[PDB]
């Protein structure tokens, strides 16, 4: 209906694998796994994007570093700052709102 | 290039920033925030890769498919193949026998 046969087929693939990743990692988790399984499939450049993703959307939350700082201190340009901001406003309030308690204090 | 103070003290940062990430989607799964977060810390590019490393990591412990046929299903060529192998045989034994018992059933 919304995509054709192939890139449908393609994109129910991906979403599957997707998922068995997440299940992968939600078990890791209960198991005390996480950090070799983490470890095992994100490069070490990878992870640490994601740590400083974390402090990019943290401060942008905070709202009290400014831009010069945000390049400066975590490398984030302006079209990262403008990306990520996005990110924000895309995702459900509930998530932000969660975002906002657990990084925030 | 044997490690500095300086270059101790910005790996002991990345590595908590790190955690944070890890601490923070640990909590979103357990609120069942997993899926949004890591739609806003991931792009969609990169959980393609984890989803594909899954099952490169999965092929590789069943030792049934072929070089050929790694690189023709899964996008793995020999360096690829390679690296992988190295990452599972320095995952910790506890890692690795998990992996075994849920990817291969
Ligand atoms: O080595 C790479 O290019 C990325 C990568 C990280 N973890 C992996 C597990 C299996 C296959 C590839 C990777
Ligand atoms: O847009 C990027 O360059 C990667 C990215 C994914 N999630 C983010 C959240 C905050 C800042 C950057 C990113």
Redesign the interface.
Known sequence: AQQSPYSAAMAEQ?HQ??L???D??????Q?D??????????LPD???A??????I?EELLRGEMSQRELKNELGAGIAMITRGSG??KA??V??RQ?LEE??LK
Request: charged content about 25%; glycine content about 2%; overall charge positive.
């Open positions: 991906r694998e997707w068995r990743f997440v992968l990692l939600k078990n890791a988790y198991n796994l996480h950090l070799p399984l983490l470890n095992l499939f994100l990878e992870r640490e994601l740590g400083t993703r974390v402090r959307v990110y924000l995702a459900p509930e998530l969660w657990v990084l």
